[PDB]
Design a protein that fits this description.
The PDB classes it as de novo protein. There is one protein chain. By secondary structure, this protein is mainly α. It has one domain (1-413): Leucine-rich Repeat Variant (Alpha Horseshoe). The chain contains 29 helices and no strands. The chain has helices spanning 3-9, 16-30, 34-43, 45-52, 58-71, 76-84, 87-94, 100-114, 118-126, 129-136, 142-155, 160-167, 171-178, 184-198, 202-210, 213-220, 226-240, 244-252, 255-262, 268-281, 286-294, 297-303, 310-324, 328-336, 339-346, 352-365, 370-378, 381-387, 394-408. Helix 20 packs parallel to helix 23 and helix 23 (310-324) packs parallel to helix 26 (352-365).
Length: 413
């Protein structure tokens, strides 16, 4: 028997001390390379460790949990071992322990498990783990509270059943309160959680909106930490892709001007998430469009049209097409920002989506005032649009057609 095996054997000793020392050494190993975590699994350490989770020695528990938690950070193979060994159900019980040091390792273990496949997340949910974890979000031990938030955030990045569990357990309200926490880590986790939740079904986005999360998230966009901003912007973008009521919430909370500001962040993710949110918001009702225009959004979005970041460019193009399908005021805005000329150049982009969105925005602008139709004209748009009538992209095609008819019919539709 090798180093590892002798340890696994040394785990079932009648002497508690010998025992705790074996869990400590396996834990240390589990914190190394993946290959080492496999060495334990093979030796059969996972099953043994899980039995010690029910020891009557709160300390023997702690050392075995820490060992599992560290094994749970390895590959899926390891995570399944714990699950198969029936570890999730147990760890879940340890969540309610009196020894806070058992809670921390149990929660950390569970959280590391929730970062695995959707199956592992199903297991935690099926084991009634969510509601318990939701209670730990208010624990008095900063560390237990952090592992819990991280656990829920991971579960929220899984099946809808998972998201619904959190929502149907009062979780959203609790996470939204954690947004205004004091611990950097707790706050970031809660923000990630909600963005993960906001990317689910409408029930989910509505739950976040009804708990007043939007206002809070809008305030988070002003954090001085790009890492926190990403999550907030992302959560807001996911909320904005929701129904019209969700959009109105963002608008009313003043989210639009704040997002317009974040459109020039030097952090690419913040910038992308911001553009996506505005793109989503611009797909809502007229007033939402108004808000972008009144916040100076159009001029900014126009500059982002030449962003060397393909993702950012795509969201700006989409945002501008959507804004362009609004009232003539919205159209005059794009025209005044120099937008037409830029879009005309974008009609021949090699990126299918940038192109399509450009075609769409020029078609929408082509159905506006005489000044708008002329702006296109002057930019040499008729020509560039015609060449497009014979492209493989059915969508680009339809938009070029639509754009040209609108020009010929002097706007009349």
């Amino acid at each position: 028997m090798n180093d590892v095996e002798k340890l696994v054997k040394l785990l079932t000793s009648t002497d508690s001390e010998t025992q705790k020392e074996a869990a400590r050494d396996l834990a240390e190993i589990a914190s190394g390379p993946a290959s080492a975590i496999k060495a334990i699994v093979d030796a059969g350490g996972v099953e043994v460790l899980v039995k010690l989770l029910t020891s009557t020695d709160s300390e023997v528990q702690k050392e075995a949990a820490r060992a599992l938690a560290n094994i749970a950070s390895g590959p899926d193979e390891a995570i399944k071992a714990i699950v198969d060994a029936g570890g999730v159900e147990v760890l879940v019980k340890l969540l309610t322990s009196t020894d806070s040091e058992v809670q921390k390792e149990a929660a950390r273990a569970l959280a590391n498990i929730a970062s695995g496949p959707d199956e592992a997340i199903k297991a935690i949910v099926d084991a009634g783990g969510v509601e318990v974890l939701v209670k730990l979000l208010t624990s008095t031990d900063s560390e237990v509270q952090k592992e819990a938030a991280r656990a829920l955030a991971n579960i929220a990045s899984g099946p809808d059943e998972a998201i619904k569990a959190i929502v149907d357990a009062g979780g959203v309200e609790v996470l939204v309160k954690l947004l205004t926490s004091t611990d950097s880590e707790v706050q970031k986790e809660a923000a990630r959680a909600l963005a993960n939740i906001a990317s689910g079904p409408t029930s989910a986005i509505k739950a976040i909106v009804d708990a007043g999360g939007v206002e809070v998230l809008v305030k988070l966009l002003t954090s001085t930490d790009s890492e926190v901003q990403k999550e907030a912007a992302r959560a807001l973008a996911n909320i904005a892709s929701g129904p019209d009521e969700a959009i109105k919430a963002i608008v009313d909370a003043g989210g639009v001007e704040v997002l317009v500001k974040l459109l020039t962040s030097t952090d690419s993710e913040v910038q992308k998430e911001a553009a996506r949110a505005l793109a989503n918001i611009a797909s809502g009702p007229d007033e939402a469009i108004k808000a972008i225009v009144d916040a100076g959004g159009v001029e900014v979005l126009v500059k982002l049209l030449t962003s060397t970041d393909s993702e950012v460019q795509k969201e700006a193009a989409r945002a501008l097409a959507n804004i362009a399908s609004g009232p003539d005021e919205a159209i005059k805005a794009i025209v005044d920002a120099g937008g037409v000329e830029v879009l005309v150049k974008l009609l021949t982009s090699t990126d299918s989506e940038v192109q399509k969105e450009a075609a769409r925005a020029l078609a929408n602008i082509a159905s506006g005032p005489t000044s708008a139709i002329k702006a296109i004209v002057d930019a040499g748009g008729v020509e560039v649009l015609q060449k497009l009538l014979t492209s493989t992209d059915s969508e680009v095609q339809k938009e070029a057609q639509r754009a040209l008819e609108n020009i010929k019919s002097g706007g009349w539709l």
